[PDB]
Every structure is written in structure tokens, then in C-alpha cells.
Amino acid sequence: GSVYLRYFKGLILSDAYAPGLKWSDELKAYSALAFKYRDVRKYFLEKEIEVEENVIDSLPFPLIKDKIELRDYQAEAVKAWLKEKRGIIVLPTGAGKTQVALKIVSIMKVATLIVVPTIDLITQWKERINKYLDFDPGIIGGGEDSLKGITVITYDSAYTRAEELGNKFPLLIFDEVHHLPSEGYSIMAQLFASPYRLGLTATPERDDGKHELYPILVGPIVYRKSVEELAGKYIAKYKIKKLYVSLTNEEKKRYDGLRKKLKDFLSSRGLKLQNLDDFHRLVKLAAKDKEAREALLAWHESLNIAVNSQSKIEKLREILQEYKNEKIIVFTRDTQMAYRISKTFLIPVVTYKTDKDEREEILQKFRDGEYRVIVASTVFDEGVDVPDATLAIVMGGYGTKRQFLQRLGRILRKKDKEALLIEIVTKGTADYRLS
Template sequence: MADVRLVYEGGTIRVEGVERLTDAAPDGAFSDIEFDPRSETGRVPAVQYAALRDRLAELDIDVDDAVFESASLNLSSDYQLREYQRDALGAWEGNGRRGVLELPTGSGKTVIGIAAMERLDVPTLVVVPTIDLLEQWEKELDREFSVPIGRLGGGEQRVEDVTVATYDSAYLRADELGNRFELLVFDEVHHLGGEGYRDIARLSAASARLGLTATFERSDDAHRAVEELLGPVVYRIDAEELAGEHLAPYDIKRIEVELTPDEREEYDRHQEQFTDYLAKSSITLTSGSDYQKLVKRSGTDPRAREALLAKQRAREVMMNAQRKVDRLADLLDRHRDDRVIVFTAHTELVYRLSERFLIPALTHETAASERRAILDRFRAGEYSRVVTANVLDEGVDVPDANVAVVLSGSGSEREFTQRLGRILRPGAGKRAILYELVTEKTAEERVARRRR
């Protein structure tokens, strides 16, 4: 009879025979096992399963492990990894099959994920943030592997040995799925830092955990929680290192524009109202948490609310400056034979540009079927340009483009990296270019520096 039996139960590992560990282990070796008087067994969170197994093995304790029902799936694919992809996969395996890989958009993160699945040949859950990515992964896995592909999301709830799920669906079924999959693959893994989404990894007993992203760190430091659940970044390579061979070579050009006299007067008036409030209230905005405190204060302080509204109006003036639109007209004329994506921060401006330049518009209001139709026509060359507010930043398979124009955006490095990645798909003789339009003598200059 085994000394100890391990069973998965509702996001925890039940340790039967825990009393036998007292004599078999040094003091404190299993102090993290909590005694459950209801079942008269020990318990640890499921995320600690692999570490518990390792300790039991080190102390030569006989274990009846009933957590997983291991099964070989005979997974194989036709992918040939590039050198940097092999290095990334090797770094992950060298870290005990735990950790995050940070590679630019277009570098083949999906390929590495599929290679990891093939290498381990165990039941796998792939978690993605959007329905678009869900469908892309499902299609790719179905093409590569001769096993049924499960899907959780987009109106379907079908679990197979290889399953793709949205973060929302995986979160809702986290305790149920916790011992169903021995490998977890998180695409756009920075989303796992969300408080609720962490349960997907926390309630799982999977010992193999792989995170994929183009930009790992989050401004709220929630990436540190991801490191605790998956492991640290074990491999990192940027677009500049891959440009020319594996990604298109590229240039980034910053174009500064002036506000019109009327815009300047309006911007200065609103900005001054905001800075005056900060000065009178002795508030210094040195971090995101400082800004959050100001937002909270606006709930009870009318002056704080007016200051924030003034800040928002100033931001709208600088981001939607008329001379940006004028320069966009010049750029569209210059690149009339190229594939162009125009990025903005505001949906209203998207529709204004769409109407003025007769460009298809993509926003959060665009139906999924219409978005697919627009991107298919862009891919086929029927459309040579599109304008969007944020929806192409992440999680959408964007057809080949070689010019991006960023009219406005946040100070997020992730957003900027994603937008650059949309034009880096390699092609014969291709050189990509990203134009960044910035209004002079406004806060946008600081925003642009921060995202770069």
C-alpha cells in the first residue's frame, strides 16, 4: 500500500495519508499542506501539485497518484522550427517546462506552442483572449493534429484532449478542468494577470505551463502574479533582431504636426484647468496608481471631476488634430500602391476618416462577419487600406500590410509593439514603414516617448 495518495478535487490536491508524512519527512518539509477536518486529509492548492510531487520523490515516499489519467495522443506536426524558435522552446524546457516566451507579433509564437504540444504529447488546454484567436488556433490545430479539437467559447462548450478556450470560458470552468490537461498554453499571456483569470492557472494541476506574448510586463505589475503561476520570462527576442530575415525590415518615422490656432486655444484652456487643480491639490502624477487615486477622488469632489473632464477634452483635441488628418491625406497619396493600416484611439475619428477617404472602418461596433469580410477583401487586394480603433491591436489575423499610420494611441509599449507587428510579415523585397503622428507642444509628446 502506498504511503500517500493524491487526488484532484475542486481546484485542490487532496493528500490522503498525510499523517504518515510526519515521520517520513524533515521538520517543516510539508508545512504548506493544510489539514482538512471534514475529509480528514491534507490539502494543497492544485497549482502546487508539481512541487509536492517533487518533494515526495526526493524523500522516496511511495505515492499513489490519481490526479491525472495520462494518455498518449500521438501528436505530430509538419512544422520545421526556425533557430530562434528552437532556442525559445529549449529555454522553456530547460526551465522545467514552465515560463513565458516573449517574441514579436508575426514571429510564429503559435508554431512554438504547437511544437511544445507535440514534444510533450499530453492533453493540452490552449487559452486565448478573443474569439478571433480561438478560431485561428482551432483551425491551426485541426490542420496539424489528427485528433478532435475541443472548443470552449463562441457559443460552443466541447472538451477534447486538445482544447482551445477563451480566458472567459476557461475561468468559468477552471475547477472542473483542473486535472483534465497536463499542459497549459496561454496565448497573449499578459491577460492572465487579470484577478479572475488567475484562477485558470491557480486551480490547475498541470505541471507544464507555457506563456506566449509580444509584451509581457503590465503597467499594474500584475505580470508578477503571472510569474508565480507560470514562471518568469525564459526567452526574449525583439523585432529588430529578427528584421531582415524572419520579419520584414522596417523604419519608424515620427511626424510632428501643429495644432490649429483654435485647437491650440482649446487645448491650452483645458490643460491649464487640469494642471491648476493638481497644483492647488498638491497632487503629483508620478505613477498609474496616483492617477487612480485622482479618479476615486472625482467621485466625491466636483472639482476633481471637472479637472478630469478637462484633461479628457484636451486629450481629444491633441489626438484628433486636424493637421494629422491633412498629413494622413498626404501619406495615403504617397502610398497609393501599398497596403496601409491606419490606427487611431477614437472610434468617432475612425468613422470620420472612413467617410472622408472612403476607407473601410473596423471598430468594436463592427460585426464579426463584416470584419472577416473586410479583412478577406484586404487580403485579396480588393481593399488596399483600412482604418481602425484598437480592434486590430491584438488577437486578429491581419492580412499582409507594409505601411502603418498611428494617428493616436496610448502610452502603452504593448499597443505600439502590436501595431508595428501588423506590418512585419516578411515578403520578397518588402520593407515596412510605420508613421507616428504626434502633435507638437502637447502631452502627446510624452505619451509617444513612453510607448517607445
Template sequence: MTDASVRLTFEGGTVRVDAPRDLLETLPDVEYDPRTETGRTPGFRYATLRAALAEHDVEVEDRVLALSDLPALRSAYELREYQHEALDAWRDAGQRGVLELPTGSGKTVIALKAIEALSIPTLIVVPTIDLLDQWERELGTEFDVDLGRLGGGEQRVEPITVSTYDSAYLRADELGDRFELVIFDEVHHLGGEGFRDIGRLLAAPARLGLTATFERPDGAHEVVEELVGPVVYRLSAEDLAGDHLAAFDIKRIEVALTPEERERYEEFQGTFTDYLAQSGIQMRSGSDYREIVKRSGNDPAAREALLAKQRAREVMMNAEGKVEELAGILDRHRGDRVIVFTAYTDLVYRLSERFLIPAITHEVPKVQARRRILEKFRRGEYSRIVSSHVLDEGVDVPDANVAVILGGSGSEREFKQRLGRVLRPKAEGERAILYEIIAEETAEERVAERRRG
């Protein structure tokens, strides 16, 4: 090692700095150790140390983090506007800081999207076994990777690991170089004596704290600010009152058409787009579609184009991949109250027969019959039902906590009506879920994107 080089290594919760003494004396929070003639700083100062070294014209040999490889991660959750703002605020703050948001605002979803965005080894620290179990389930549902667990009788470390504060406290000096991102759920706990050592000993440069109540009566939130960062985004329950605090999350899942479905879809869709090219119609608004309908009265080509468009829509709406995805969702939510929406009556009956789910369509002969099914759903005799558009308006639908949309229009009104069916979590502090299953690389995907616009 030359006088103009620096070597960084991790040792028991600290970063050892091998460098000339005159350089060590310029680095913030680095203490000189005369026995080894090296410098040393707490693990949590690693990011600050790297930033300080960047100001010097020195070569840095960085051996602090011993990270395992992770594939690119992807979560099906979609963020609301304020959740986007919170995540952006954290990233703009150098991927350090605390989000203070009320219960029911979806802090966990924001954290999952942070993990997805960075796709780096991550440690999640939680205060209770119940939260340990919940996080493990969520992580397992969202990410197709092996998960570590520290707590509840298990001590298993993987690139993505969830731990109790107690277990993290016992092993922080040992594991401090294994993670690049650490997420502290209920981060105010980190201010407690002992637990604050978790934050000190970990070298993870990216740090995210989640809480509904950041400030502590004992003032220990100032310690949390030092270890994790300040509050970078804050909203109260009053700020989110009304539409914004509806206790549900949206998970968008894309499925592929089978080769046979793809061939049929492209054939039908091609007939429609060929007609558009020949007729000069660009489909920029609903009036363009109405023009094709008007022409179809005396133009065989227009009539054929409309029929082809309808058949292409049937292919993507009834895709086998959607049915298989629904099977997995129903299996995961065996204990929940589920409503499945489709656009086609035939698909309603197909799902009803396959999954033994009561069906409600406009073909159910009497209003009284539909009411009997809904009443049994309300009483819990049925835990799931499948329906077409008949439930969209004017029907008193019992509370559900999971809804699945297997196709429909891009109408914002229709989408919000269906969301309204899942705004009743099973218990306080939980959130309902709406799954939107989309056929990828189809017009359905584009329409859904426009609706989110």
C-alpha cells in the same frame, strides 16, 4: 497503504495527499486537514509536490491526472532561430514560464510546436471569441485530432481543448485533472481577480504563457509568475527589427510519391548514382556536377546519367501528391491572395487548367500580357496566380499573403526571393504563410534540408 507510501488524488481543484502526518509536515505548501487526517495543496502546486516527494524514500501512488490518449502530433510549421531559442528556454526551465515577444513574432507557432513536441492533453486559454476561433482553426489545420471548445455557446471537451478565460474560470475545478499542459495566450489576463483561480485550480504541471506585455501596472504579473512561471525568454520589437520580424511563417509539407512515381524515380536516380560510383565523382560541390556536364560532351554514359538525373527531378517536382496538397491549400485559403511557384512550365499550365488560375511563364507572348495579369491580381480581380521562375527577379509582384512552392532549387537566394512575395499580411496582427511542398525520400528533401543547414 503502508506508513512509507503516499497516495495523491485530485479533488475540486486541489491535490489530496494521503500520507503519514510527519511526512505531510515536511512537504511545501501542504496544509494538514485534521478532519480527514490528510494533506491538501492547490492544483497548481502538483509539480512542486511531486518534486518534493522525490526527495523522500516513499512509494507514491499518483492518481491526480486522468488523461486521455493522444497520438504523436506533427505540425508543418518551421521555427525561426529565435523561436527555437524561446521554445528551448521554456523546456530548459522545466516546461514552465512565460515568453514575452512582440506582436507579429509568431508566438502561436511556438506554442503549436510545444504541443507537437509533448503530444500530451493540452488546454489553451484565450481572452476573446475571435482568438478562440483563430486557435481552433490553427489547431484543426495542424493536428488530425478532435478538438474541444469552451466558449461561444459551445462546451465540448477533448484532449486538446481551446477555451475562453471566462469558460475556463467556470470549469477549472471540474477539468483540472484532464490536461497535462496549459497554454495561456495573452497571459497577463491571468493576473486579473477571478481569472487567477484558473491557474490555481488546474493541476497541469507544464505551463506556457504568451504575451507581448508581461508586466501589469497593478503588479499582478507577480501572481502570474507564481502560477505559470517567470519570463524565460524575452525579445523586444527593436531586437527583432529588420529581417527577423518579417510577418510570415513557413510550413513545410512532405508528400509521398505514388508507387508508379516511386518506381520511375528510383530507376532514373539509380542510373545517375551508378554513374557516380563508376566514375568516382562524389558530388560534394557544384564543381563535381560541372565535371559531369563537361564529360557528357564525349562520354555517352555521362550524358545518360545527366538525362536520368533530369528525369528523376521531373518526377519529384511534378508529383501528383503535390497537386492534391495544393488543392487543399487553395480550399483553405479561398479568401486570401495566393501565388503558386513551380519549376516547370508544363506544371504551370497543368495547374492553371485544373484550378482555373491565370498562368505567368516566359512563354506568355508579351510582357504587356504578364503585366495585365499582375495588375488584375493587384486590383483583386484575380485572387491567385501560378508562375514558374519568371517572377523571381525584376518583376513588380503585387502583395500576396500566401505563397506555395511546389518545387525549385535549393538556392537560398531563390527561396528568399519567393518569401519576399508573402511578407504582406492581410491585416495588422496577422501573418503571411509560405507553404513548401516537398516529395519525401527524394533528392528534393535532402536539398531543402541542406538549405536550412
């Protein structure tokens, strides 16, 4: 047969029934919201019905230079999306989602509408497109109204102008795509006819659970990597190295003495301290048994010795001597260690309680190069807003908190050709990671 398939004010209309279409009495056609275009067209082709369609009145794709070079996890994401050209790419903040998107834009070479949730992400996307694509894009939002083959628009104005733009862009890129299932925006997604959709988010799940709507509105997830995955040995772009030191003779005496006290107690009560449920029991008993408290104290005090051993400062001196010419930031968890390190080497220190005036002075005098090395604590301070350093030296910590890993990924992604993260650990002391 000769089915006619036509776009109309955010809907698709049809001579004939296709699954997902429903007859309109008002329109005298089988209809649905324009987003069903791709699927009903493909329904008709795969049954050899001649499809006479005027649906997509696409803007001309503009002239671009591709200035993008991708890391290789970035390209597997592009390769994933390209198989179906309808889906979400989940990457953490700072893993470069924008450049995966703009690479797709250049591969596809079709008019592209990029939907963002805030005015700052308009100007940001505008800047990234100039740099990496050498095109000044159209902008709809904030009070500006220019419309070009590549356009950045707010969710609000995409919703407002959907029937007008629904058929103009074949590629539809939803930044912060977790916004899309919200009340107004979900019907905006359904009004576009755009057959090719790319969603970007680091937070695909929603507390209302409306991420269940993704396959309908954008496509399913087709690629996801955590920051933990993206901080692997073979995938990250900085080396991770553990240098091992031994406790002081006096430290080893105290440390071992504490461990024995703790172990003997635990054995004297039929308790163990292997996992984090064991810990909860010991903390619970410590509220009302003095000896349990002192045991939990022994645990903390021995842990503190291993983490903050003076031998780590001696090793730190060796490292700072090996890298006289690099830009080094030393991290601790405790504030007291940061002061030991700043006194020992006469380097600036930053804790969570540093006045914002001085804190701003230190990091800037660091990025300008008057301070070649600083030390910083991380208890109660995110490693945020920090400049580029070639070398991170992490002294202590209960492992690495996920944000910390993320935060350090950003400080050394900038860093150089290849940068280095050194963690200093003590040799004989027990593993304290409790599951």
C-alpha cells in the same frame, strides 16, 4: 514512507506534510490547491519517499501530423521553455507565438488545454490547430461544448469548470497570459493540477503590477524578444538597405544657410541642441523670444529639406525601374510628399484623410494587382490592414516608430522568399536623432 497524493475538486491532498501544504481539518489531510502538485511530488521524490499518487486522470493525446517549420528565434523559445516546462514566452504580435505553442504541444505529446480570452481567439486557435497539427480540437466556449485530448476553452469556462478539468490536461497553455492574474482567473490557475504550463503574451506587464504573480500561476518569463530585437539584420527575414543621395545644389544652399543661422543663434546665447532636453529648453524659450522661434523654425525647415529632397524622387525612379516586376509600396511621413510622388509617377496615394471607401478600393485594387505600386503616408496612420508587398521604400521619417517597424514586419513577412526594405537618406545632412 508511503505517502498518498491525491487530487480532489481542485486541491491536492497528502498523507504527509510537504512545504506549501497545510493541514485541513475538514478533509483530514495536508492540502493545497492542485497547482502545488508538481512541486510537492518533486519534494517527495527528491527525498526518496515512495509516492503513490492518483492526481492526473489525463485524456488521451490525439493523433497529430506536425506541419510546423519554425524560424530559429521560434525554436530557441521552445528550447527555453522545455528546460522547466513551466513558464511564459514573450514575443510581439505577429512573431508567431501560436506556432511556438503548437510545436511544444507536438513535442510534449500530452493532453493540452489552451485558454484564450475572447471568442475570436477560439475560432482562430481552432483554425491554426487544423492547419498546423491536422486535428479538429475540442472547443468549450461561445455555446459549444466538445472535449478532446486537445481543447480550446475561454478563461471564463476554464474558471467555471476548473475542478472538473483540473486533473485532465498535463499541459496548460494560457494565451494572453497577462489576463491570468486578474481576480477570477488567478484562482482558476491554482485549481488546475497541470504540471506543465506555457504562457503567451506580448504585454507581460500590468498596470496593477499583478504580473508579480506569474511564477505562482504559470511560471516566470523564460524567453523575451522585442520587435526591435526581432528586426535585427541577422534575425529578420527581409533585407534592410540604405541608399544615399545628395541634396540639390539649391537645396544644399538653403539647407546650409538654415544650419548656419541656427548654429550662430545657439552660439550667441550659450545654448546647444544635442539632446532632447536641449530641445525642450529651445521650445520653452521660443514661446517668448522671437529669435529662438526662428531658430527652431530653421531646425524644422532644414530637417524638412533633408527628409523630402527632390533627389529622393529621382532615386525612387531608378528603384521603380530596377523592380518593374515586384509589388511596391512607398511610405512617406508627410502627406505633401505622397502627393508629389503620386503626381510624378501616376500611382495611387493613401493618406490618413482618404475616404474609407476609396481607401478600401485602392488597397484591394493593389492586392488584386490592378495597381502594381502605391504610395502611402504614415503621419496619423498606422501601417495597419495593408496587404503583402515584395518591396517597401521608405522615403522620410524621424527614424522608424516601433509600430512602424512592427507594421512593416507584417507586410513583408508575407511578402516572398526574401523581401527588401529600402530607406532613402541624404548624405551631407546632420543627424537629427536627439537623445
